[PDB]
């Protein structure tokens, strides 16, 4: 809906900003979940609202822990559009922090909010490309470097 | 009568004012006070009422829902709504002035709405051409531009406004692609 209403312009800005705010609210919990999963790896969650299925029975010291620890939700497959580009990066970042914590034994929602407030018309797809992904890229590279 | 009249003009036909789906808005000529001039003015106004009704139908069809589809069509509907908006404001002001003075004649209302009496049929012509030819995409932008050189200053101003909206949309597109 937000992608289809981008091209209208400020004629529907009453609807445009409303949908923007609604999407921000809807995505914040996902932002928090992803952040916690890639900062620690645990959640206060018990069954997730998240696309990727978690296999909690995978032994930590096992070859398939690199694989079976997180299970893709195939029906075809549950997924969200804007989550697709960073899905692989999310997966590797989270598993990398998990491994780093195993071997070693501000909120992303807020960052997105402040970025979109500073920036905000402009393509919301390009808005997300500009603001959201670079944070993930930096965190992913930092995690990869630390792990390596 | 007058309030029912304006509400029919507001797209809400009453008992006397009957909206045949393709027979348009028409007058239930039954009131004992109706006169041939009265009915003639009523029919002249039901003309523009039917125009507004069809405008509303089309805009709902191609703005609330996604041939006859694409961003151009939604922009067309939005600009048509915007152009009709001053008609609505004039209608409301006329209602207000009737609510002030009850001695006002329906002829006064016809005098007031003559501003859009000529404007509406040209807009209907344009939109029915667009629909019948199923004009789609940037072709539509040319379409009104073809008609944008019309001889009706009111119609020409409305067409310039809608064409500026179309220009803005395709400028958004071109900025994205550049």
Automatic annotation (TrEMBL), chain A:
It is found in: Cytoplasm, Cytoskeleton, Microtubule organizing center, Centrosome. It comes from Sus scrofa (Pig). Signal peptide: none annotated. Component of the gamma-tubulin ring complex (gTuRC) which mediates microtubule nucleation. The gTuRC regulates the minus-end nucleation of alpha-beta tubulin heterodimers that grow into microtubule protafilaments, a critical step in centrosome duplication and spindle formation. This is Gamma-tubulin complex component. Belongs to the TUBGCP family. Component of the gamma-tubulin ring complex (gTuRC) consisting of TUBGCP2, TUBGCP3, TUBGCP4, TUBGCP5 and TUBGCP6 and gamma-tubulin TUBG1 or TUBG2. TUBGCP2, TUBGCP3, TUBGCP4, TUBGCP5 and TUBGCP6 assemble in a 5:5:2:1:1 stoichiometry; each is associated with a gamma-tubulin, thereby arranging 14 gamma-tubulins in a helical manner. Gamma-tubulin at the first position is blocked by TUBGCP3 at the last position, allowing 13 protafilaments to grow into a microtubule. The chain holds residues 444 to 708 of 1061 of the full protein.
Automatic annotation (TrEMBL), chain B:
GO terms for biological process: microtubule nucleation. Keywords: Cytoplasm, Cytoskeleton, Microtubule. GO terms for cellular component: centrosome; microtubule; spindle pole. It is found in: Cytoplasm, Cytoskeleton, Microtubule organizing center, Centrosome. One of its GO terms (molecular function) is gamma-tubulin binding. It comes from the Eukaryota. Belongs to the TUBGCP family. Component of the gamma-tubulin ring complex (gTuRC) consisting of TUBGCP2, TUBGCP3, TUBGCP4, TUBGCP5 and TUBGCP6 and gamma-tubulin TUBG1 or TUBG2. TUBGCP2, TUBGCP3, TUBGCP4, TUBGCP5 and TUBGCP6 assemble in a 5:5:2:1:1 stoichiometry; each is associated with a gamma-tubulin, thereby arranging 14 gamma-tubulins in a helical manner. Gamma-tubulin at the first position is blocked by TUBGCP3 at the last position, allowing 13 protafilaments to grow into a microtubule. Component of the gamma-tubulin ring complex (gTuRC) which mediates microtubule nucleation. The gTuRC regulates the minus-end nucleation of alpha-beta tubulin heterodimers that grow into microtubule protafilaments, a critical step in centrosome duplication and spindle formation. This is Gamma-tubulin complex component. The lineage of its organism: Eukaryota, Metazoa, Chordata, Craniata, Vertebrata. The chain holds residues 1 to 191 of 667 of the full protein.
């Amino acid at each position: 809906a937000i992608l289809e209403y981008d091209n209208v312009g400020e004629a529907s800005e009453q609807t445009v900003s409303l949908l923007f705010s609604l999407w921000v609210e809807t995505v914040r919990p996902y932002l928090q979940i992803v952040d916690e999963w890639i900062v620690h790896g645990h959640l206060c969650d018990g069954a997730r609202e998240f696309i990727i299925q978690r296999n909690k029975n995978v032994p930590v010291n096992h070859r398939d822990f690199w694989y079976a620890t997180y299970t893709l939700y195939s029906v075809q497959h549950t997924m969200v559009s804007f989550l697709k580009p960073v899905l692989k990066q999310i997966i590797m970042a989270g598993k990398s922090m998990q491994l780093l914590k195993n071997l070693q034994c501000k909120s992303l929602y807020t960052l997105f909010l402040e970025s979109v407030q500073s920036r905000l018309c402009q393509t919301f797809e390009l808005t997300l490309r500009s603001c959201l992904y670079p944070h993930i890229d930096k965190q992913y590279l930092d995690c990869c470097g630390n792990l390596m | 009568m007058i309030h029912e009249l304006l509400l029919a003009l507001s797209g809400y036909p009453g008992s006397i004012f009957t909206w045949n789906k393709r027979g348009g808005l028409q007058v239930s000529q039954d009131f004992p006070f109706l006169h041939p001039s009265e009915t003639s003015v009523l029919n002249r106004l039901c003309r523009l009422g039917t125009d507004y009704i069809r405008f509303t139908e089309f805009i709902e069809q191609y703005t609330g829902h996604v041939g006859l589809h694409g961003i151009y069509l939604r922009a067309f509907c939005t600009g048509l709504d915007s152009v009709l908006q001053p008609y609505r404001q004039a209608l409301l002001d006329l209602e207000q002035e009737f609510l002030a003075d009850p001695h006002l004649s329906i002829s006064h209302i016809n005098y007031s709405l003559d501003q859009f009496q000529l404007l509406f049929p040209s807009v209907m012509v344009v939109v029915e051409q667009i629909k019948s030819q199923k004009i789609h995409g940037c072709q539509i932008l040319e379409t009104v531009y073809k008609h944008s050189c019309g001889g009706l200053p009111p119609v020409r101003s409305a067409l310039e406004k809608i064409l500026a909206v179309c220009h803005g949309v395709m400028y958004k597109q071109l900025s994205a692609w550049m």
